[PDB]
Design a protein around this ligand. Structure first.
Ligand SMILES: [Ca+2]
Ligand SMILES: [Ca+2]
Ligand SMILES: [Ca+2]
Ligand SMILES: [Ca+2]
Ligand SMILES: [Ca+2]
Ligand SMILES: [Ca+2]
Ligand SMILES: [Ca+2]
Ligand SMILES: [Ca+2]
Ligand SMILES: [Ca+2]
Ligand SMILES: [Ca+2]
Ligand SMILES: [Ca+2]
Ligand SMILES: [Ca+2]
Ligand SMILES: [K+]
Lengths: 99, 80, 57, 99, 84, 57
DNA sequence: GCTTTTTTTTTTCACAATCCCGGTGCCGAGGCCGCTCAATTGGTCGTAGACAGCTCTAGCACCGCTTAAACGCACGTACGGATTCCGTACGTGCGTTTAAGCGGTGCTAGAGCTGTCTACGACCAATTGAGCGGCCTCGGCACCGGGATTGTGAAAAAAAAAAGCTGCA
DNA sequence: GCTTTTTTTTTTCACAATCCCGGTGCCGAGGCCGCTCAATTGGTCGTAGACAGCTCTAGCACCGCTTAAACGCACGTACGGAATCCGTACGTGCGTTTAAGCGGTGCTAGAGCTGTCTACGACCAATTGAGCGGCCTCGGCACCGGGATTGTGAAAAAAAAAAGCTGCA
């Protein structure tokens, strides 16, 4: 009974699954730590409201999901199904997030 | 302190799922990480700049929301 | 009006961000107005680029 | 025999020329007429200060010139040298111009 | 006085080819030229409509360079060298 | 200062829009600040993507 | 047209995901209540701007020439895209490990509020110099012609591959 | 190892475009000047917000559970990207055609400025109720669960088509 889905088939399931849901996809503490880590470099011994870390996550993730959407199109524009660094750089170059 | 690695492969995959992405090169997980870092720097800097101008030591939702708006990435549901 | 519909289709009496995010993104005009806005806890509209779906059987 | 530059070698000459210069590349009157043609559609019997028609042109040519930049990057992303309408649409999709 | 012609065609193939030269484009599909015109058209609609609104609000019958400028800045396409 | 230099460079005594554009576009920071700005009569920086040149030797 | 074999089509067995029942449990929507603070009522006072009327900027129309530019076609190159092909970088799914998540307890920075007092900014009237518009000239810069330099490309000679023999064995 | 053909790289000019100078002429930068209106001075008066004092909120630290999620390896399939191939789409260059651009002229809508009066909105003090913070209840909704359903594959099994044989009129 050695049952295996072929490559790409759970990926699709996942795509369906997560587009359908709203919960945040990055684990919260690690995120929190990252915020705090980055915070330090500007001003030491800061604090955060929990709600300000959540606004930051909601924003970052949304940023990222969106960037992926555009990345995915850039993949497909080069007749690929697999997103690659260069796709992201094009997405951002066109958006004007970098030169 | 290298918390950037807390942004795991799994979490990154998930995000890209929701972006309708099907297959992902191995080099992307780091590329994502950098991008994600640059975004946070730009948002947090601004946020904290609002914090330092109100002479506080505690960053507020509003600080974030006011930054995000400067950055064109306006956010609903945290006190706009 | 639109979100409240979206709830009533989900079998819910409370409007929630998703209902709002659905209402707005599936309405050409509103979507445009709130083009550069993020609805916290909204999620996205189900959408899988065709090329990625398998040859249909 | 007669001289004849290989396909591309003048195109590159043209590129160098036009990037080096600042002069407006659409003919001034046809642009003028087109502006008035579009003007009508909103309000009849309208006048334009030349400076306003010119400000429209500067703005147009600029927009178009950038779009070609983003477009050429979309072509090159698909391992092409030749820009196509599918390249433009991607630039504009990613730019946020259209859905 | 007179209603205008079909001018969009006056954005000739030469001109469109020149603009894409300025943008670093080497080779150009046949289909580009008409697609551009449509894009150009939509651009001008969008700006001019906004400009004309600034005209109409000021109760003037003559679109000013500033109308254009205010519209263009509204559209996120800020233009230097014509006022404001 | 910058415009001026790019004018001297052109062997031209008076700064013109091109000079402004070259100053601004060639300077990482000025460029960012003026990211969504359109200089009239400014043109663009000489830039031909690499893959569009023929094979150099 | 037969055999064989390779590709494609069809069914036939599976499995996460879904849905409809039931049932249960908890906390935050949603309403109540006792203020209070912010909208309302009324009248006074000062000027912002609709409106009429004049000026005169500059926008539109019209024409006929010069020629730069657009148009259309002849022609073939190097481009796009199809097909075919191989290596491995990817996704799926084990099992073992990790640390997030929760619920809760404990401490205190610091957010935020209150009231108090005065330095500082609005508001005015009079004073007056800088920055306006108008005006004039002259040197930079646009334009051209002419000559030096630069780079493309064709065709003809050296190197430098496959690409197909010849053994060899 | 040989041997010829392509094939690659190098050599030799011929041409065409581009670059660069001095020369010539035109007009707009540059600056002077005279007058106006908007900055400055030198007053007063009110309240914005700095400051100290206090409350208590919500941010922080730590602990120990119980998982669900991360991780790290084993195995292979489908995907990316190189190589090969053919057809023609698009660049180039030519002669023909078209109308933009030039400048000039005349005619005037309408931009834009002034002066006159008043409706209307800020700005007082006074009345007051709609909406605020706090707090209490209970039903919506999360959660489970189970068992039926279906939508979604994947494998294996059947049909059709491909490739290789063939023999035959
Ligand atoms: Ca007045
Ligand atoms: Ca304090
Ligand atoms: Ca003076
Ligand atoms: Ca002056
Ligand atoms: Ca001078
Ligand atoms: Ca006070
Ligand atoms: Ca392929
Ligand atoms: Ca309440
Ligand atoms: Ca109470
Ligand atoms: Ca209730
Ligand atoms: Ca119930
Ligand atoms: Ca169940
Ligand atoms: K606090």
């Amino acid at each position: 009974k050695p049952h295996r889905y072929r490559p790409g088939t759970v990926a699709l399931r996942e795509i369906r699954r997560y587009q359908k849901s709203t919960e945040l996809l990055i684990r919260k503490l690690p995120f929190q730590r990252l915020v705090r880590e980055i915070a330090q470099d500007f001003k030491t011994d800061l604090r955060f409201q929990s709600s300000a870390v959540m606004a930051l996550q909601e924003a970052c993730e949304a940023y990222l999901v969106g960037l992926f959407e555009d990345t995915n199109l850039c993949a497909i524009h080069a007749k690929r199904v697999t997103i690659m660094p260069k796709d992201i750089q094009l997405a951002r170059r066109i958006r004007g997030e970098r030169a | 302190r290298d918390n950037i690695q807390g942004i795991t492969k799994p979490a990154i995959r998930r995000l890209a799922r929701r972006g309708g992405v099907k297959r992902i090169s191995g080099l992307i997980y780091e590329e994502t990480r950098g991008v994600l870092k640059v975004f946070l720097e730009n948002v947090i800097r601004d946020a904290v700049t609002y914090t330092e101008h109100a002479k506080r030591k505690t960053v507020t939702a509003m600080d974030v929301v006011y930054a995000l708006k400067r950055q064109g990435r306006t956010l609903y549901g945290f006190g706009g | 009006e639109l979100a409240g519909n979206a709830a009533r289709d989900n079998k819910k009496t409370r409007i929630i961000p998703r209902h709002l995010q659905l209402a707005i993104r599936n309405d050409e005009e509103l979507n445009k107005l709130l083009g550069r806005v993020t609805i916290a806890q909204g999620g996205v509209l189900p959408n899988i680029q065709a090329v990625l779906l398998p040859k249909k059987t």
